[PDB]
Amino acid sequence: KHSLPDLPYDYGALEPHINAQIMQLHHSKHHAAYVNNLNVTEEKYQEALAKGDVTAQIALQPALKFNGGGHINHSIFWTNLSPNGGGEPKGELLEAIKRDFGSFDKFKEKLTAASVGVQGSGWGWLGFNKERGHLQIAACPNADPLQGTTGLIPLLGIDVWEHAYYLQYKNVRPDYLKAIWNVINWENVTERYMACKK
Amino acid sequence: KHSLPDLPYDYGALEPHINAQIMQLHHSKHHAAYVNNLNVTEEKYQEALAKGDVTAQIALQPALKFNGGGHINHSIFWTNLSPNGGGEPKGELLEAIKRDFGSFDKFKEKLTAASVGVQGSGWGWLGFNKERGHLQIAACPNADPLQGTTGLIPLLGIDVWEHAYYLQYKNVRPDYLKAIWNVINWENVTERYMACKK
Amino acid sequence: KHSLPDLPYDYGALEPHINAQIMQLHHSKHHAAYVNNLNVTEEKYQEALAKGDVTAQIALQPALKFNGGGHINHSIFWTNLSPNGGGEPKGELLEAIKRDFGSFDKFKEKLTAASVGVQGSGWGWLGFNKERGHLQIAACPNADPLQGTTGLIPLLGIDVWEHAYYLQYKNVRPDYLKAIWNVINWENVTERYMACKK
Amino acid sequence: KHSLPDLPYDYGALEPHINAQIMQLHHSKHHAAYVNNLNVTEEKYQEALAKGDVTAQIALQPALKFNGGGHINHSIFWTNLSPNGGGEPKGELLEAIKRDFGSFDKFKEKLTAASVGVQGSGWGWLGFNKERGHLQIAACPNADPLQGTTGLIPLLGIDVWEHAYYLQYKNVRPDYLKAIWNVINWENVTERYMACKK
Ligand SMILES: [Mn+2]
Ligand SMILES: [Mn+2]
Ligand SMILES: [Mn+2]
Ligand SMILES: [Mn+2]
C-alpha cells in the first residue's frame, strides 16, 4: 500500500513564494487522491494480471500512469522544496551544472524555459542521464513521471499544472517560476544527484 | 487577422455559477493570448510555406494547433454560455438528444462524465457526426479543437482546464460541472445543431 | 501463460488473396514473437507490482501494450479469415450494416478507406459500440488493441502493417485491401456480433 | 514545388546489403508518393492560411507532417548511403563519436539498438544537439522528421519501416541493421557534422 507522505514542513512554511492555501490543497487534496486512486488501480491490475486479461491490463494503463505518476512526482516535489531553500547548490552538483549548462543562471533560465513552455498540464525536470553521465533538462506532460517515461533520474521537478500556482499567480506562470527558485531545497537535489554517483 | 471577440454579456453575468474573476481572466488574459500568439504563428507559417521550409512548418504545428485551438474553443465556449441559460433544449435538438442518449438527463451525465474524466487539461464536447448523422460526445486534450482533430461539428463545449474553475471550485471539478449546466445557452447550441441540418 | 494459437487452416488456404509465405511468416514469426515477449513483460510486471515499483510498472507499459495488443489482434485476425470466406454476411449482421452504413458496399468503402488511410503501422476495425448499440468503424495505430483502447468490441480486423501484405502487394496496399474481402469469414464476424448484442 | 531527387547511385549499387528491388521501390514509389502528397497538402494549406481557416490548417497537420517528413527523411537517407561506403569515419567526427559514445563500436551498438527498438514504423538517428554541442542518438515514429520534432540536426538516419527491408530480410530487422553498416556514406555524415559544428 503506497501512502501519502507528510510534508517536511508546514503548509505556510513557503510563504510568500507559494501561499498556504495552495500547499494545503495540493498536498491534502491532489496528492491524496493520486495515492488512493493508485492503490485502487494496482488492485484492479493484479486481478487482471492474475486472469491473463490483457485487454483489462491495457485499459488500466492510463489510470496507472496518471495516478502512479501523480504519486511519484509530488512525493519528489515536496522534498525538492524547503522554507530554507533558495540560493545555489555547491560542490559536484554545482560543477556539473556549470559544465552542462554553462552556469547556474543559464541552467535556471533553461529549466524555467522548459517549464513555462509546457502547453497544458505538466512538469519541468532537471534529471540525470545515467548512460551519458550528465545532467539533462526535460518536460513531461500531465502526470507522466520522468524516470518511468524517459529513463532519466529526477533531481528537481517544477510542477506547472495550473493547480500549482493559479490561486496565487493566476495566468502568469512566469511569476510562479520566478518565485519558486526561492524555496528550492538544493540540499535534497544534491542528495539525489550524489545518489547517481554510485 | 483573427481577433478577440467581445463576450456576449458582462463578466459577472454568470454569477454565482462562474464568478466574474474567472470570466474576466479567462477572456481578457487566456483567450487574448491565444489570438495574438495565433496571429504570430500564422505569420511565421506563411514565411515557412513561401520558402518551402518543411522543417519549419512541422516545428510550428504545436504552436498553431495550441493557439489556433485555443481561439476556436473559447470563441465557441462564450457563445455556449448565457446569463439566461440553463433548462433544456427543445424541438429537434431535444429529440436528437433523447434519441442518441436515451434522455436529456442521461446526456448530461455522459457529457459530465467525459469532462470530469479528462486527465490533465482539456475539453468535453457534444458534437455532430455528419457521416453518421447523429450526436456524439468526445473529449479533447489540451487546446486541440474538436472539428480540426475529429471531424465532428462542435455544438456545446465544456472547458475543464483548471483555469476555467479552480479559483472558485478548487480541485472539485464535479462542483464546477454541476454548476455550469445552469448557464448553458441552449438557444445557441440549437442554432449550431440546426446549422448541420443543411 | 499465453500461447500462440494454431491457425484454423493451412498456411496456403487463403491463396491467392494472401499468399502462403506471408501467412506462415505472419503466424510463426510475428504472432509467435508477440506471445513470447508478452509472457516476458507480464512476468516482469508481476514482480514490479508485487514490489510496489510504480516506475517499473509505467516503464513496462509500452512493451505490455505492444506485445499484448499484438497477441490480441492477430488471434482475432486469424479467425476473421477463411478459405471458404468472401461474399456477404446475412441476417442481423447484414441488417445492422446496411442500417449503420447505408449498405454493404458503403461499408466496404468505409472500412477500406479507414484501413488504407492508416499512416504507418496499424489496423482498421469494424467494431460494436455497446453504449450506442450500433456498429462503428475505427483505426488503431501500431499494435494497440481495439477494446483495450476504445472500448469497442472487435468484429472484423484488417491488418495494414506492411509485413501483412508487402511481400505480395509491395507498396500497393489498396490491392491488398481489395483482395482480402474474398477471404473474410463472415460466419465468425457474425458470431462476434451476436455475442455482444445479447 | 517540391521534387523527388535522383538517387546518387544505381538502384543495385548497394548490393548485396540492400537489394535493387527495395531500392527501386523505396525511391520510385515510396519517396515519390511523399513528394506528390506533400505538394498537394502544402497547396491546400496555402489556401487555408489565406482564408484564416484554422480548423482546416489543423486538420491538414497530420498529412503535412507525414508526407513532409517522408520527403525530408528519405532525401537525407539516400545521401547517407554509398556503394563505396562502410568502414569507419575519420577526424573530428570519429573523435566526437568515441567521445560521446565511448567508442565507434559502442556507437554502432547504441544506434542499432535504438533502430531495432522501434515499435511499429520509424527511424533511428544519429544527430547533433547544437544546444549541448554534442552528438545524440534518437528514434522517431512513423515519418516524423528529426529536426522538425526534436531540434536535433540529422547526421545519419536508419529507416526501419518494414518496406525498407522486408522483401530481403523479412521479419529479421537485426540482420538488416547489421548489413547497412557496409554502405554508410561516412563522407556525407562528416559533411553534415562539420556543417553544423561551424
Ligand atoms: Mn501538482
Ligand atoms: Mn480555457
Ligand atoms: Mn500483423
Ligand atoms: Mn522508407
Short mmCIF file of N, CA, C and O in Angstrom, two decimals, chain A residues 21-22 25-26 29-30 62-63 66-67 118-121 142 161-164 166-168 170-173, chain B residues 21-22 25-26 29-30 62-63 66-67 118-121 142 161-164 166-168 170-173:
data_model
loop_
_atom_site.label_atom_id
_atom_site.label_comp_id
_atom_site.label_asym_id
_atom_site.label_seq_id
_atom_site.Cartn_x
_atom_site.Cartn_y
_atom_site.Cartn_z
N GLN A 21 -2.66 28.24 1.16
CA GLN A 21 -3.86 27.65 0.58
C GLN A 21 -3.49 26.67 -0.53
O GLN A 21 -4.10 25.61 -0.66
N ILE A 22 -2.49 27.04 -1.33
CA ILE A 22 -2.03 26.17 -2.41
C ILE A 22 -1.38 24.90 -1.86
O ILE A 22 -1.68 23.80 -2.31
N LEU A 25 -4.11 22.52 -0.28
CA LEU A 25 -4.90 21.82 -1.30
C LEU A 25 -4.07 20.85 -2.15
O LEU A 25 -4.48 19.72 -2.42
N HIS A 26 -2.90 21.30 -2.58
CA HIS A 26 -2.01 20.49 -3.41
C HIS A 26 -1.67 19.16 -2.75
O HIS A 26 -1.67 18.11 -3.39
N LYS A 29 -5.38 17.37 -0.95
CA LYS A 29 -6.42 17.04 -1.92
C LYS A 29 -5.90 16.34 -3.18
O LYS A 29 -6.29 15.22 -3.48
N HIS A 30 -5.03 17.01 -3.92
CA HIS A 30 -4.48 16.45 -5.15
C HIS A 30 -3.63 15.20 -4.92
O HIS A 30 -3.91 14.14 -5.48
N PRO A 62 -3.82 4.05 -18.55
CA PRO A 62 -3.98 5.49 -18.32
C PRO A 62 -4.15 5.85 -16.84
O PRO A 62 -3.56 6.80 -16.37
N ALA A 63 -4.95 5.07 -16.11
CA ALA A 63 -5.16 5.33 -14.70
C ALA A 63 -3.90 5.07 -13.87
O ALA A 63 -3.61 5.81 -12.92
N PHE A 66 -1.16 7.79 -14.79
CA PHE A 66 -1.64 9.06 -14.26
C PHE A 66 -1.57 9.14 -12.73
O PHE A 66 -0.93 10.05 -12.19
N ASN A 67 -2.21 8.21 -12.04
CA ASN A 67 -2.18 8.23 -10.58
C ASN A 67 -0.82 7.81 -10.03
O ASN A 67 -0.39 8.32 -9.00
N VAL A 118 5.60 24.34 -21.28
CA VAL A 118 4.60 23.28 -21.26
C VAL A 118 3.21 23.77 -21.64
O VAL A 118 2.65 24.68 -21.01
N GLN A 119 2.65 23.18 -22.69
CA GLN A 119 1.32 23.51 -23.18
C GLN A 119 0.36 22.56 -22.48
O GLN A 119 0.43 21.34 -22.67
N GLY A 120 -0.54 23.10 -21.67
CA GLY A 120 -1.45 22.25 -20.93
C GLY A 120 -0.80 21.93 -19.60
O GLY A 120 0.05 22.69 -19.11
N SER A 121 -1.17 20.80 -19.01
CA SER A 121 -0.62 20.39 -17.72
C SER A 121 0.71 19.65 -17.86
O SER A 121 0.95 18.99 -18.87
N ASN A 142 1.23 16.15 -18.47
CA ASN A 142 0.30 15.73 -17.43
C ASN A 142 1.00 15.21 -16.17
O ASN A 142 1.77 15.95 -15.55
N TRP A 161 1.31 22.47 -13.50
CA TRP A 161 -0.12 22.26 -13.64
C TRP A 161 -0.67 23.55 -13.06
O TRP A 161 -0.07 24.13 -12.16
N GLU A 162 -1.81 24.00 -13.54
CA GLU A 162 -2.37 25.24 -13.03
C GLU A 162 -2.69 25.21 -11.52
O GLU A 162 -2.59 26.24 -10.85
N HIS A 163 -3.04 24.03 -10.99
CA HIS A 163 -3.35 23.94 -9.56
C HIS A 163 -2.14 24.27 -8.68
O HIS A 163 -2.29 24.57 -7.50
N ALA A 164 -0.96 24.22 -9.27
CA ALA A 164 0.26 24.51 -8.52
C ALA A 164 0.54 26.00 -8.32
O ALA A 164 1.39 26.35 -7.52
N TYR A 166 -2.15 28.78 -9.84
CA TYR A 166 -3.24 29.68 -10.22
C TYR A 166 -3.88 30.53 -9.11
O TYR A 166 -4.17 31.71 -9.34
N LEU A 167 -4.12 29.96 -7.94
CA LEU A 167 -4.75 30.72 -6.88
C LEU A 167 -3.94 31.96 -6.52
O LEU A 167 -4.51 33.00 -6.17
N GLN A 168 -2.62 31.84 -6.62
CA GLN A 168 -1.75 32.94 -6.27
C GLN A 168 -1.23 33.74 -7.45
O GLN A 168 -1.26 34.97 -7.43
N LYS A 170 -2.31 33.33 -10.77
CA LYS A 170 -3.25 33.37 -11.88
C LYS A 170 -2.62 32.79 -13.13
O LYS A 170 -1.93 31.77 -13.07
N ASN A 171 -2.87 33.45 -14.26
CA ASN A 171 -2.35 33.01 -15.56
C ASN A 171 -0.86 33.29 -15.76
O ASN A 171 -0.24 32.72 -16.65
N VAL A 172 -0.29 34.15 -14.92
CA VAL A 172 1.12 34.49 -15.07
C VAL A 172 2.05 33.42 -14.52
O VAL A 172 2.62 33.58 -13.44
N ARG A 173 2.23 32.34 -15.28
CA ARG A 173 3.10 31.25 -14.87
C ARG A 173 4.55 31.72 -14.62
O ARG A 173 5.22 31.22 -13.72
N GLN B 21 -14.35 37.00 -11.54
CA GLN B 21 -12.89 36.97 -11.62
C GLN B 21 -12.44 35.95 -12.66
O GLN B 21 -11.49 36.19 -13.40
N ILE B 22 -13.11 34.80 -12.69
CA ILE B 22 -12.78 33.76 -13.65
C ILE B 22 -13.09 34.21 -15.09
O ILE B 22 -12.27 34.05 -15.98
N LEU B 25 -10.52 36.98 -16.26
CA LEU B 25 -9.20 36.42 -16.59
C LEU B 25 -9.24 35.47 -17.79
O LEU B 25 -8.38 35.52 -18.67
N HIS B 26 -10.24 34.59 -17.82
CA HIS B 26 -10.38 33.61 -18.90
C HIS B 26 -10.45 34.28 -20.27
O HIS B 26 -9.83 33.84 -21.22
N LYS B 29 -7.34 37.53 -20.52
CA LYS B 29 -5.96 37.05 -20.41
C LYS B 29 -5.67 35.79 -21.24
O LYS B 29 -4.83 35.81 -22.13
N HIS B 30 -6.37 34.70 -20.95
CA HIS B 30 -6.17 33.45 -21.67
C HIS B 30 -6.54 33.52 -23.15
O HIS B 30 -5.70 33.26 -24.02
N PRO B 62 2.83 22.55 -33.24
CA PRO B 62 2.36 22.62 -31.85
C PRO B 62 1.81 23.99 -31.47
O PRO B 62 0.79 24.09 -30.82
N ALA B 63 2.49 25.06 -31.89
CA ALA B 63 2.04 26.41 -31.58
C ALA B 63 0.74 26.76 -32.31
O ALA B 63 -0.13 27.42 -31.75
N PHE B 66 -2.20 24.55 -30.84
CA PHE B 66 -2.46 25.04 -29.49
C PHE B 66 -3.13 26.41 -29.46
O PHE B 66 -4.21 26.56 -28.87
N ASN B 67 -2.52 27.41 -30.08
CA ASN B 67 -3.11 28.74 -30.08
C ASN B 67 -4.33 28.83 -31.00
O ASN B 67 -5.28 29.56 -30.70
N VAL B 118 -11.40 13.86 -18.07
CA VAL B 118 -10.18 14.38 -18.67
C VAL B 118 -9.02 14.46 -17.68
O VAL B 118 -9.11 15.12 -16.64
N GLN B 119 -7.93 13.77 -18.01
CA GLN B 119 -6.72 13.75 -17.19
C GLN B 119 -5.84 14.87 -17.71
O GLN B 119 -5.39 14.84 -18.86
N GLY B 120 -5.57 15.86 -16.86
CA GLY B 120 -4.78 16.99 -17.31
C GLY B 120 -5.73 18.03 -17.87
O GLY B 120 -6.91 18.07 -17.50
N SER B 121 -5.24 18.86 -18.78
CA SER B 121 -6.05 19.92 -19.38
C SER B 121 -6.87 19.41 -20.57
O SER B 121 -6.45 18.49 -21.26
N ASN B 142 -5.82 19.14 -24.00
CA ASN B 142 -5.28 20.50 -24.04
C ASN B 142 -6.17 21.48 -24.80
O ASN B 142 -7.33 21.68 -24.42
N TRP B 161 -10.06 22.84 -18.24
CA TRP B 161 -8.71 23.25 -17.89
C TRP B 161 -8.92 23.81 -16.49
O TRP B 161 -9.99 24.34 -16.19
N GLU B 162 -7.93 23.70 -15.63
CA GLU B 162 -8.09 24.21 -14.27
C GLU B 162 -8.38 25.71 -14.20
O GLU B 162 -9.09 26.15 -13.29
N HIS B 163 -7.88 26.49 -15.16
CA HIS B 163 -8.12 27.94 -15.14
C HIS B 163 -9.60 28.27 -15.31
O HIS B 163 -10.04 29.37 -14.98
N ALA B 164 -10.37 27.31 -15.80
CA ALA B 164 -11.80 27.52 -16.01
C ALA B 164 -12.64 27.41 -14.74
O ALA B 164 -13.81 27.80 -14.75
N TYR B 166 -10.77 26.58 -11.12
CA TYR B 166 -10.01 26.50 -9.87
C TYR B 166 -10.19 27.63 -8.85
O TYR B 166 -10.28 27.37 -7.65
N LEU B 167 -10.24 28.88 -9.30
CA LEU B 167 -10.38 29.98 -8.37
C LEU B 167 -11.64 29.85 -7.54
O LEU B 167 -11.67 30.23 -6.36
N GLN B 168 -12.69 29.30 -8.15
CA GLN B 168 -13.96 29.16 -7.47
C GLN B 168 -14.24 27.77 -6.92
O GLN B 168 -14.66 27.64 -5.77
N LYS B 170 -11.91 25.16 -6.85
CA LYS B 170 -10.69 24.46 -6.45
C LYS B 170 -10.54 23.16 -7.21
O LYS B 170 -10.79 23.11 -8.41
N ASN B 171 -10.13 22.11 -6.49
CA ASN B 171 -9.92 20.79 -7.08
C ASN B 171 -11.21 20.04 -7.39
O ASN B 171 -11.19 19.07 -8.14
N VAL B 172 -12.32 20.48 -6.82
CA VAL B 172 -13.59 19.80 -7.05
C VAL B 172 -14.21 20.12 -8.40
O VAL B 172 -15.17 20.89 -8.49
N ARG B 173 -13.68 19.50 -9.45
CA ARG B 173 -14.20 19.72 -10.80
C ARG B 173 -15.69 19.37 -10.92
O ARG B 173 -16.43 20.02 -11.65
#
